[PDB]
Amino acid sequence: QVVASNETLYQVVKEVKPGGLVQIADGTYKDVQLIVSNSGKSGLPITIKALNPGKVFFTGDAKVELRGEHLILEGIWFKDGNRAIQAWKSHGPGLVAIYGSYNRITACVFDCFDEANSAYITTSLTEDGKVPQHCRIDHCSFTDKITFDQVINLNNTARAIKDGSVGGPGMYHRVDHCFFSNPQKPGNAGGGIRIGYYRNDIGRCLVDSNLFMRQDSEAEIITSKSQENVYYGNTYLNCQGTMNFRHGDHQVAINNFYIGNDQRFGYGGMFVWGSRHVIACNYFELSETIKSRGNAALYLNPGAMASEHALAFDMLIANNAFINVNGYAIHFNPLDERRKEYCAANRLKFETPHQLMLKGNLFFKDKPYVYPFFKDDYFIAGKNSWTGNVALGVEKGIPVNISANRSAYKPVKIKDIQPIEGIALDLNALISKGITGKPLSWDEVRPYWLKEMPGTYALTARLSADRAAKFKAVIKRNKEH
């Protein structure tokens, strides 16, 4: 039914049956506490949506909890928030917390909600330990987030000092067609998306067709902290950070576009920890790279095997293109001084990237940038294998024999890559085709009912006076007194 107030909303949701449809009348729902405990059924989900998306706003000291299964939240605009700053925390449930499996949140807008630290959307474990699975977050816009923690957290474990060989279960969630553009916070303040927490956690989540435009929250655009996650067809435009395989081996990044097209900031990028990854058909064209990280497009982490800063080794880097990157195409030992010290302080064995299979990659440069294609201060003959790559425009930087014949460049056929269980993608076929399509635009991801881009950071790299003030206050109270 049609509800026009928080109370009637609460009541109808408490009575709604599988296949039900709850439509929220045009208006503002202030301090709304939407708790959905009932469940829809496969093929008969319960849909809660604005009667007219774009005219329903959830505001104030609000909160949404999707606890049942087979639920759908659609066409809601979250703004003018006021949650208590002393009641919410990073690593806690998000503004919208999904505790049940098979749930979907689509065509919703989150725009500089409030000052309470937390993610905007999270999948959270119930107090008894159950892990949500098969959820989808799509066609949602996340802009001008001025609070700590990621925009989205996909959890399969509770935060703990850790490292008991145990690991979290596979989630099988999907995040697609979303828009992320948020201002830069100091330090490890939470980025765009986090999946899992430690290397023993299994993710098997699909993140595809998302547009990150000036997603500058922190150093990490995406901090993938679980095994077997697949990142496909995502566009990262002028983002001050890198898309990372932070914890967990065997991760996949295929046909993503990393583009930096101005000189305003340093952009990225992918920083890779761990082994057995598949990094293929990605396109890197960065006008400026990140100085603090080593000025590169692809960073391969030096360190101790399977540690907190897992050595990056034994992986496939194929059919990628590094076009006019103003920095190294590939840095083989970024942050090595810090990593060495870290290993020494933890009695770990410091090692450097090796057993890398670099096949059919294109490295090209014709602009007046000064960086050779590669940096490997620990180069050892034969530690890595190079086959079918092409490089021209600048010195390579390392003693490797590579074809300079561009007209003969051809992506390589790969056919021994096992697909990830639960994810319907033919990895061998996708890699073999080479790089397809091009960067995604706003119209290709925006909520069907939304015409204009919310917020101001994406197009101006600036926050309004009111939002800039709140942002400083948030940052200030989180720093030493």
Beta partners for 58? Answer: 29, 78
Judge contact between 154 and 197, C-beta under 8 A. no
Given 63, 139, 177, 225, which residue is catalytic?
Answer: 225
Please name which of 73, 46, 70 lies closest in space to residue 62, comparing C-alpha atoms. 73
Residue 33 CB coordination number (10 Å): 15
Judge contact between 320 and 330, C-beta under 8 A. no
Alpha carbon distance 247, 249 (integer Å): 7
Please name which of 50, 34, 41, 51 lies closest in space to residue 20, comparing C-alpha atoms. 41
Distances (CA, A) of 480 to 85, 118, 460, 476: 17, 20, 30, 8
Can you give the length of the chain in residues? 481
Alpha carbon distance 192, 471 (integer Å): 17
Judge contact between 322 and 366, C-beta under 8 A. no
Give the resolution value in Å: 1.7
The answer to whether residue 225 is catalytic is yes
The answer to whether residue 247 is catalytic is yes
Given 308, 351, 383, 433, which residue is catalytic?
Answer: 308
Q: How far, in whole angstroms, is CA 172 from its chain's centroid? A: 15
Distances (CA, A) of 426 to 86, 148, 252, 254, 418: 47, 36, 12, 11, 9
Distances (CA, A) of 273 to 49, 65, 146: 41, 34, 28
Beta pairing class for 56-60 and 77-81: parallel
The answer to whether residue 127 is catalytic is no
Judge contact between 73 and 41, C-beta under 8 A. no
Domains and CATH numbers, the chain: 1-481 (2.160.20.10)
Beta pairing class for 136-138 and 104-106: parallel
Given 173, 247, 250, 396, which residue is catalytic?
Answer: 247
Q: Which residues 6+ apart lie within 8 Å of 306 measured at CB? A: 199, 249, 274
Please name which of 245, 257, 202 lies closest in space to residue 220, comparing C-alpha atoms. 245
